[PDB]
Write a protein that binds this ligand. Structure first.
Ligand SMILES: [Ca+2]
Ligand SMILES: [Ca+2]
Ligand SMILES: [Ca+2]
Ligand SMILES: [Ca+2]
Lengths: 733, 133
């Protein structure tokens, strides 16, 4: 509170810039209720808690955010800004994390000389760069004989895929495969990406690219693993969203000769593609993209006939969703005779109409074995389940075949896996989709917490300093995935045909409200709940959660398909048919974590600095949002609680001699620093002395920087005076 | 005003602030400026402006007596010991050291930095004048 003197600068809120710099006119007296500030207009700030202090300029623009002494949100924002805009630097460290800000401009920082520059160097001796992270993983692979994961997260288009592209480029260079993987992209995007209300090309799954190496750590080939596919999107879309791209690519290619058998209407004509009312994306030509997708299958060894099989199966799915059920009241339904969408479905899928029709409208019930008729509602649920099952299995089939062009016969000695994964997703209206994504983030974040904690332990021990803080997100994870947690209660409710979104909501309240502090209820709603995730609170609307979680595939419907004459279709299928989307999500996520936990992880966070693909353009609102969702702000709050500033005794001397008398300068410079510092900073809990470094709590280095500033300012007024005396006396003699 | 200036000047001489400048205080100031006057010389000087013949000079005796560009130029030529029209940090560290004041090299470099308006790492005349003002 002695930091808030005259001319001291602080950050205050601003509706447009988020944080605004301000300079103190009058010193703050303990008791004052207003600060006298100066914007570059003067203000009267409404205070008991003071505004954020600006970092001294020697710390500004540093390579590692954790070097800021005032370690807070505006510091983070400002530092990335000046590095990005003033210095055109897109890469900045945040401890072990690499932060990458999308410049929307092709930079010449990825060439061979730069790769050679990064090769053989240590983490931190070079400027932040995707190549350094790559070099670390490569180095540690050989060194520790451990497999590595490079986790590259963020919202689609913010730069994940570019980062992955250059990690691979780097591996290929310091050690074909990078070419093939790049070539598969339009395939994966077409079956795995969709337009959402906030992103035109969003990945709705995590892509894990295993780069394999022999005993000599040379790339032999790759293996693509996929997790967390968003099944609900196959048969449902919110307003302004689309199903997966490839459906639109097909519906926009309806008139092409080779696709006439598919009998595709336009996107607005299929139940499975129209619900969002947005069959097109500005700037996207789905017809063109179809060509690119077909080309990519060709490049990856998928035969022209197999490609047609893919398209038969997708059109099948489209027509399947248009099959209309007729209620023969009220535990009973039928399909109209010679029903067009069913006829087309069965033709494209090589199965018999009546056999398919029967098992779309009946259930085989096996102490006795009956063939039960089913209601329209049960029939639509089963049909939708089947659609989702067909799609997922197709998705896998495609990935497997991409992997055929990527595997090598060579024995694999080790791998580095690059994970392309979404981060935290919060819209104005959050549903089951967002709930699963943020669940996944809670698990990845946990691996990250534990990893940083471990490395901190080692670093403390290496410097002979005792311990330290661990911020555990197991409670959040448990609220989501344990018995009587969100997912478990959701499954429970779905096996009750009287269950609804509202009855489910109520049981969430009875179980968790005022029982778990991470769970909350909006005051004016009984149709929503609020989860305190890692980075932010998120409110979910319960609506649709039961419908999207259900996923019961009727065995007899599958059996029909398995007997198809269309010989690709059975290749897809070579409880569990009553598992649930949420539960399958849990399973997939746990599989992913099994892979990840069996490796040393490395972290890249990719962010969008603006919403319009503006070259080097930094929008504060967007950036704060992006930093928060990628976890940086919370991680940094955690860092800011310990001993984030870390200086060598050498560096402490070099910077702060000017604060020293000659009476306390010794030969044991390290001991000088200890005694000098115990004088300047009386509270001994503000720092810890280590083998080679001093660890400072937040603010401490900034305070030392103010003392240094003070001294040099006085030294200057003093010099100016002793030349005023000298020149006055010489005037008068 | 100008009056308070004269007072500040008076006070430079009047070390003990006793209200009068003795011959000893004069020789002190003089010796400082590289001068070396005999007591005799100091007395005649103090007598020259000692109106009340009391042997010492007070402010109103002083104020009565006293009642720049060149001065700064002369000052500049003292710092700039290698007459190249630029004052280096070295030249300024030489003079300040001479002047009595003990600064670190960082303190010196800062003063140069602040006075170096055209950011060229050394102080020219107009920069020197501007800093003195
Ligand atoms: Ca005196
Ligand atoms: Ca007198
Ligand atoms: Ca000179
Ligand atoms: Ca100059």
């Amino acid at each position: 509170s002695e930091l808030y003197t005259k001319f001291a600068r602080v950050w205050i809120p601003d509706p447009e810039e988020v944080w605004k710099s301000a300079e103190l006119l009058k010193d703050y007296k303990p008791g004052d209720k207003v600060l006298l500030l100066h914007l570059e207009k003067d203000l009267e700030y409404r205070l008991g808690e003071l505004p954020h202090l600006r970092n001294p300029d020697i710390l500004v623009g540093e390579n590692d955010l954790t070097a800021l002494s005032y370690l807070h949100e505006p510091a983070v924002l400002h530092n990335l800004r000046v590095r990005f805009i003033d210095s055109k630097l897109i890469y900045t460290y945040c401890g072990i994390v690499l932060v990458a800000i999308n410049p929307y401009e092709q930079l010449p920082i990825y060439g061979e000389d730069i790769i050679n520059a990064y090769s053989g160097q240590n983490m931190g001796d070079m400027d932040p760069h995707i190549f350094a992270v790559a070099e670390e993983a490569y180095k540690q692979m050989a060194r520790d004989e451990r497999n590595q994961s490079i986790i590259v997260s963020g919202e689609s288009g913010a730069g994940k895929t570019v980062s992955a592209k250059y990690a691979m480029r780097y591996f290929a260079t310091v050690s074909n495969v990078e070419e093939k993987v790049l070539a598969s992209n339009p395939i994966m995007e077409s079956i795995g990406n969709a337009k959402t209300t906030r992103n035109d090309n969003s990945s709705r799954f995590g892509k894990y690219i295993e780069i394999g190496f022999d005993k000599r750590y040379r790339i032999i080939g790759a293996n693509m693993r996929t997790y967390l596919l968003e099944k609900s999107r196959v048969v449902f879309q919110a307003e302004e969203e689309r199903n997966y791209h490839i459906f639109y690519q097909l519906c926009a290619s309806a008139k092409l000769p080779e696709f006439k058998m598919l009998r595709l209407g336009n996107a607005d004509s299929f139940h499975y593609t129209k619900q969002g009312g947005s069959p097109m994306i500005e700037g996207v030509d789905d017809a063109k993209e179809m060509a690119h997708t077909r080309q990519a299958c060709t490049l990856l060894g998928i035969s022209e006939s197999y490609q047609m099989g893919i398209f038969r199966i997708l059109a099948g799915i489209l027509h399947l969703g248009n099959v209309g059920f007729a209620s023969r009241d009220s535990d009973s339904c039928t399909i109209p005779p010679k029903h067009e969408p069913l006829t087309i479905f069965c033709d494209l899928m090589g199965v018999d109409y009546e056999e398919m029709c029967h098992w779309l409208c009946h259930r085989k019930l096996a102490t006795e074995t009956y063939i039960k008729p089913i209601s329209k509602l049960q029939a639509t649920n089963a049909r939708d389940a089947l659609a989702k099952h067909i799609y997922a299995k197709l998705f896998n089939w495609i990935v497997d075949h991409v992997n055929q062009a990527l595997h090598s016969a060579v024995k694999q000695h080790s791998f580095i896996g690059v994970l392309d994964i979404y981060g935290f997703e919060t819209f104005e209206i959050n549903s089951f989709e967002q709930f699963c994504i943020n669940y996944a983030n809670e698990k990845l974040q946990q691996q990250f917490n534990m990893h940083v904690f471990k490395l901190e332990q080692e670093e403390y021990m290496k410097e002979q300093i005792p311990w330290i803080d661990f911020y555990d997100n197991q409670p959040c994870i448990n609220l989501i995935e344990s018995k009587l947690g969100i997912l478990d209660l959701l499954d429970e409710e779905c096996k009750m045909p009287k269950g609804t979104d509202d009855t489910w909501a109520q049981k969430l309240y009875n179980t968790h409200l005022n029982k778990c502090a991470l769970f909350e209820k909006p005051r004016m709603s009984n149709k929503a709940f609020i989860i305190k995730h890692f980075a932010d609170k998120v409110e979910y609307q319960c609506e649709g959660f039961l419908e999207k979680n259900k996923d019961t595939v009727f065995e007899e419907q599958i059996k029909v398909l398995k007997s198809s004459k269309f010989k690709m279709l059975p290749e897809l299928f070579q409880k569990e048919h009553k598992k649930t989307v949420g539960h399958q999500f849990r399973n997939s996520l746990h599989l992913l974590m099994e892979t990840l936990n069996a490796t040393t992880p490395h972290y890249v966070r990719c962010i969008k600095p603006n919403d319009f693909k503006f070259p080097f353009t930094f929008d504060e609102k967007r950036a704060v949002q992006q930093l928060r969702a990628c976890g940086v702000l919370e991680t940094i709050r955690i860092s800011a609680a310990g001993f984030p500033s870390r200086w060598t005794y050498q560096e402490f001397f070099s910077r702060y001699r000017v604060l020293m008398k000659q009476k306390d300068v010794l030969g044991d410079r390290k001991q000088t620093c200890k005694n000098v510092l115990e004088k300047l900073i009386l509270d001994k809990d503000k720092y810890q002395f280590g083998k080679t470094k001093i660890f400072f709590r937040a603010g401490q280095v900034a305070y030392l920087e103010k003392l240094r500033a003070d001294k040099l300012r006085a030294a200057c007024i003093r010099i100016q005076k002793t030349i005023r005396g000298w020149l006055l006396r010489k005037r008068y003699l | 005003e100008q009056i308070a200036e004269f007072k500040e000047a008076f006070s430079l001489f009047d070390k003990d602030g006793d209200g009068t400048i003795t011959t000893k205080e004069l020789g002190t100031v003089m010796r400082s400026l590289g001068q070396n006057p005999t007591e005799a010389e100091l007395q005649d000087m103090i007598n020259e402006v000692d109106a009340d013949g009391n042997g010492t000079i007070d402010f109103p005796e002083f104020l009565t007596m006293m009642a720049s560009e060149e001065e700064i130029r002369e000052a500049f030529r003292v710092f700039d010991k290698d007459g190249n029209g630029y004052i280096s940090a070295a030249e300024l560290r030489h003079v300040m050291t001479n002047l009595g004041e003990k600064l670190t090299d960082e303190e010196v470099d800062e003063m140069i930095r602040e006075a170096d308006i055209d950011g060229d790492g050394q102080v020219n005349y107009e920069e020197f004048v501007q800093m003195m003002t």
